[PDB]
Design a protein around this ligand. Structure first.
Ligand SMILES: CSc1nnc([C@H](Cc2cc(F)cc(F)c2)NC(=O)Cc2c[nH]c3ccc(O)cc23)n1-c1ccc(C(C)(C)C)cc1
Ligand SMILES: CSc1nnc([C@H](Cc2cc(F)cc(F)c2)NC(=O)Cc2c[nH]c3ccc(O)cc23)n1-c1ccc(C(C)(C)C)cc1
Ligand SMILES: CSc1nnc([C@H](Cc2cc(F)cc(F)c2)NC(=O)Cc2c[nH]c3ccc(O)cc23)n1-c1ccc(C(C)(C)C)cc1
Ligand SMILES: CSc1nnc([C@H](Cc2cc(F)cc(F)c2)NC(=O)Cc2c[nH]c3ccc(O)cc23)n1-c1ccc(C(C)(C)C)cc1
Ligand SMILES: CSc1nnc([C@H](Cc2cc(F)cc(F)c2)NC(=O)Cc2c[nH]c3ccc(O)cc23)n1-c1ccc(C(C)(C)C)cc1
Ligand SMILES: CSc1nnc([C@H](Cc2cc(F)cc(F)c2)NC(=O)Cc2c[nH]c3ccc(O)cc23)n1-c1ccc(C(C)(C)C)cc1
Ligand SMILES: [Cl-]
Ligand SMILES: [Cl-]
Ligand SMILES: [Cl-]
Ligand SMILES: [Cl-]
Ligand SMILES: [Cl-]
Ligand SMILES: [Cl-]
Ligand SMILES: [Cl-]
Ligand SMILES: [Cl-]
Ligand SMILES: [Cl-]
Ligand SMILES: [Cl-]
Ligand SMILES: [Cl-]
Ligand SMILES: [Cl-]
Ligand SMILES: [Cl-]
Ligand SMILES: [Cl-]
Ligand SMILES: [Cl-]
Ligand SMILES: [Cl-]
Ligand SMILES: [Cl-]
Ligand SMILES: [Cl-]
Ligand SMILES: [Cl-]
Ligand SMILES: [Cl-]
Ligand SMILES: [Cl-]
Ligand SMILES: [Cl-]
Ligand SMILES: [Cl-]
Ligand SMILES: [Cl-]
Lengths: 221, 221, 221, 221, 221, 221
């Protein structure tokens, strides 16, 4: 990775042994849970395309998800090549070539070119672009591996409201929907799918009720 | 995070693999105990909005508390926008735009803007403001998840005074009350709820008795 | 914490994740044994009031001792305010205000003020002053939680002298007494409370006998 | 290893105790699984020939693979000596001798010569060349130790498609074939070896079907 | 501790959390085995009197040995005060006072004075002097806690020579004797106390036989 | 140890707590296996004589091997003193004395002299010389502790060839023989000691057969 600074210039170091270990462990332990994506994002802070490819390569098993992840990278690289068509001509000294999708993914570029792209007067953040493409594929994998729908989340007749809200928002996290759709699920299904004893109490609170007030109201079931 | 210095300028680094691991572990182990908040505060020392969002994202489960935490952030961001109304105009070179609540929470701002806000001649500590908002929501979660009241804390007939004082102050820690209210509980309920054998001894000591003297007096029950 | 240097200027960093973890672990494992105090002192080397408060806040349970610790801090802060009466007047540029007990304890001061006090031409070591006050309270907690007296330490009829000396000096460590009192216990009770077979041998050695010579003499009981 | 920088010059450090430990552990745990190679590549980032030889030497057992690895290094060193024939003459001051295959492998060169080769105005990356030769031998070891063929990977009659795709791409990873051959296996054998119930559904999707769409289609077997 | 450098000046840091932990663990695990002393010496590399006192304070139990260790420190400090008599006079600016035994042990000196003594044009290594005194006391503790003599080490009738030599040199390590005495034990007792079958073979080899040749000769008992 | 650099000057630090721990652990776990020597070499990278002596001192038990190791050091130091006879005369300012074998082993030299020898215009690498002497003694210990000969390594009648080659090269690693002798064992005993079914197949392949081709040929026994 490359760690930035305020006065002077940055440095290029290797992915620390404990970063590699933590990434392998979280995949063995949690596989494709929604919280694995932020763990990957934080373990790959300041990573170059080579550093990001190194992380995905350390995954044993989960090969159907790794292949789906490559197909997503292909789509984002082919979209980049359509928006950014490279120009024919010899590259002048001082300046550097503009990157293609295969250079962002690390396939047709060198580590020196990646470092040179990320470290420039006008910076070319190829490490952040490739990471965005990977996280896109990882969110698809998470949504594909979720075995439930937010529509099936109903409160049990004797289940505490706090346990139902915990299962509600975990299920919503893995839903393939824009924020506006999720707000409609948040403001409609939570009360609509609560048990009859809770549902009546929540419906009396009205439209301005916070989650805190709703949880306080359904304490005695 | 950004680690400050005395002579020169600061540096911007990533959240270390062991900081991420310790935060995930303390949530699995202790969930919403009052001592988890200082652990979060110390693990997020010098954090930017992105670094703070990264920490909350690594939480698996506890989704009702995470949603309550978002609603608290919304309230503090809407209060910030009322106190600090942004001005219409093109931002001049050298200077930078004044932050909105959505920039402090990391939603409508970039990492570069967050670093630029925290590192300035007149500093804009967006990392500390967002952290204050998070700790506010975390204290509400702790108070909401406490299953007891300081009023129900009575000393057992054969329970050593030291064990009753340990249960008294743990229960008080999670109480939703200002310091003045807590001092009234400290100076009234401790002696009032002690067992008859202890209560008489503590009442003889009077008003100037320290906790140390009270604990020394109730040694032989 | 703030790590000092020889040529140049110091830096202000956060309490490392392993320092926080080691402190929580030693409290779960050993609670208020005399050796916990030096562990705290070494884990809080170069700490500011905020860093010291962070450490005490991470303690789960042991709330009677934490309250006793606050009352000790109150006494030392009120003694500081009596010895160091602050003066009324606007603080001049360049110079900084003189600290009160509530600034040393971190309650009515900011991290920037604490850093500014510890880093100055004439230094104001508020971090070391608060740490001294905490260690005072911790020694009171250790003495309060010791369940034995040095007077009750007698050697068993078949107990090896080495085991009796180990129990003697551990018990003396938690005694509330000045060094001069402890030397009188060291030079009087050790031989006086040894078993009759050992006591006679030690009494023949005389007044100039070292602990090494005493331990060598009582090898064969 | 040697960690590069942007402004100034690099430094030469030792292989950290945890890098050595992680490498020994991954060999005891996973032996010659395809994901061990990227772990080696990341643990040997910026390594000199001596640092790379140190890593292979720490392997206990797996001696048939270590001997096969030496024979591969011999072939790559003899190919280097054919492409790069050294010239007879005394080496001038300032300049340095051009490396032979035995200098790249660390046998007939010193650590100072390796550091001098990697750190130069026109750099001679002997550390990266030797690492390429090692990874070549490691890929041969992985292919030699794979106990299955991509041709034998058929879907079970009651086996979920996701489990069959996981076993398909793991088996393909260890296949000794160029990327073009692997694409023919990817576009031909996956559907051809699926169970009759899945095979019919996949064949209806056609030629433009992604892995994501194929996995979505075979959800209900 | 204080870590030295070549170009510039040194820095003063705290005893790392893992150094404190490793020291506590080796005492719980091995107590006063001869190999604990080098572990202490390496964990206290570059330590000041305060850092050395911090390490001994973290020892739980072993209080008879800790008291014996204080008495040894007293003897070395009183010997220092006899060899180095301090002079009466006000200390001039720039220069610093010459240390007493109580300043070397950290009792009547401050951390700043210890740093100032170790960092000077003519250096006063108080950290190394106190460490020498501690290691002296630790070697006495090791010799006092050894439960065997080199004279009692005889080879078993069916015991392999290698096992007898291992028990011989471990027992010699804890012997209270100068190097010349130990060489006489090495050149006399090893062969003299070997079993009759080995003793005859070793006696035929003569006076110039190495340990390697002796071990090779007694392979078949 | 002393970590070298490119622009400027090196630094002298202590052996890290985890380096000391890893060295003690590998000796408890593997004792004198051939792979322990490279672990020692990598854990002692950039070590001074004092740092190397510190490592050997941390070994509990294995005292016959530690004594054999001292006798080897004695031989290499007496050979150094024969090749490098020191000259009588007062050492001039600026220059430093030429080292004897007892200075290289750390017995008659100080840490400052060792640092001064390794850091010089014409460098005197006493740390590397002593390390070479130690590794010589360690290889003798490994050869002395090997309980088998390469001549006794025969393939089982039902044992897979891969398992026989693994046992062949592990046994050869601990053989006391020059590289030319080992090549004769590699090119003669491997095929000569294979089982009759394998031996015939390997003999048909001829003289140019690689280990990879030999292992591929004996797959079906
Ligand atoms: C020098 S560029 C680089 N270096 N390494 C990698 C990727 C890293 C990787 C990516 C991924 F999406 C999932 C992974 F599991 C691994 N490794 C791999 O393909 C190795 C691999 C993992 N399983 C397999 C199953 C079958 C197989 O035959 C190979 C593999 N790339 C890289 C290669 C191709 C691409 C495109 C997607 C653009 C075609 C991108 C990067
Ligand atoms: C680029 S800004 C950013 N990046 N990440 C985050 C927060 C981080 C987070 C915050 C929190 F209070 C609790 C969390 F668990 C996580 N992540 C999330 O929402 C992800 C998430 C966690 N569970 C869920 C259940 C349902 C769901 O659909 C999503 C989630 N934000 C962020 C987003 C919104 C907000 C407002 C509160 C202002 C609306 C603030 C920050
Ligand atoms: C921004 S200053 C600061 N920040 N944090 C702290 C202390 C840190 C702390 C101190 C202590 F002696 C024992 C502790 F366990 C914790 N935290 C606390 O009180 C939190 C706490 C721990 N259990 C409780 C049980 C009941 C309760 O209602 C609260 C708590 N202070 C701080 C507060 C007051 C004081 C005085 C003693 C001067 C009144 C000093 C510091
Ligand atoms: C100062 S150069 C250096 N330093 N160390 C090494 C290699 C490192 C190593 C390489 C490898 F491919 C596999 C290994 F297991 C180890 N160590 C070794 O041979 C030691 C070793 C491991 N098992 C053995 C079984 C039998 C035996 O008699 C010895 C060994 N070389 C090195 C030596 C030779 C070569 C050529 C391949 C060019 C002939 C290259 C490097
Ligand atoms: C600011 S100087 C300093 N700071 N801490 C220490 C020593 C550190 C220590 C030394 C030792 F030899 C053995 C130890 F276990 C601890 N701590 C202690 O005495 C605490 C201690 C450990 N068990 C005890 C049993 C009884 C008791 O009443 C106290 C204790 N000194 C220090 C004190 C005295 C001396 C002389 C030997 C010169 C009199 C030297 C240093
Ligand atoms: C300030 S020089 C230094 N500092 N420490 C050491 C060695 C380090 C050591 C070396 C070794 F080969 C094996 C070891 F186990 C330890 N320690 C030791 O002898 C301690 C030791 C380990 N077991 C023993 C059994 C009996 C005994 O009476 C002592 C010991 N030397 C050192 C001493 C002598 C020599 C010569 C070989 C030249 C005579 C070299 C260094
Ligand atoms: Cl690791
Ligand atoms: Cl509930
Ligand atoms: Cl979407
Ligand atoms: Cl609730
Ligand atoms: Cl970790
Ligand atoms: Cl009590
Ligand atoms: Cl409040
Ligand atoms: Cl009590
Ligand atoms: Cl940790
Ligand atoms: Cl005894
Ligand atoms: Cl006292
Ligand atoms: Cl004893
Ligand atoms: Cl390690
Ligand atoms: Cl499936
Ligand atoms: Cl190929
Ligand atoms: Cl699926
Ligand atoms: Cl630790
Ligand atoms: Cl033997
Ligand atoms: Cl002696
Ligand atoms: Cl032997
Ligand atoms: Cl450690
Ligand atoms: Cl085989
Ligand atoms: Cl040889
Ligand atoms: Cl094979």
């Amino acid at each position: 990775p490359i760690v930035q600074n305020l006065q002077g210039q940055m440095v290029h170091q290797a992915i620390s042994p404990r970063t590699l270990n933590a990434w392998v462990k979280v995949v063995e332990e949690k596989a494709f849970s929604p919280e694995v994506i932020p763990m990957f994002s934080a373990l790959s802070e300041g990573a170059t395309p080579q550093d990001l490819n190194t992380m995905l390569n350390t995954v044993g098993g989960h090969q159907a998800a790794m292949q789906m992840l490559k197909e997503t990278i292909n789509e984002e690289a082919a979209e980049w090549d359509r928006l950014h068509p490279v120009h024919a001509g010899p590259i002048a000294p001082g300046q550097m070539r503009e990157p293609r999708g295969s250079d962002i993914a690390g396939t047709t570029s060198t580590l020196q070119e990646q470092i040179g792209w990320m470290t420039h007067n006008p910076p070319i953040p190829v490490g952040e672009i490739y990471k965005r493409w990977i996280i896109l594929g990882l969110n698809k994998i998470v949504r594909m591996y979720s075995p439930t729908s937010i529509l099936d989340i109903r409160q049990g007749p004797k289940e505490p409201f706090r346990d139902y809200v915990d299962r509600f928002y975990k299920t919503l996290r893995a839903e393939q929907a824009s924020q506006e759709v999720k707000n409609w699920m948040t403001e409609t299904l939570l009360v609509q799918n609560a048990n009859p004893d809770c549902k009546t109490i929540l419906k009396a609170l009205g439209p301005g009720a916070t989650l805190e007030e709703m949880m306080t109201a359904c304490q005695g079931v």
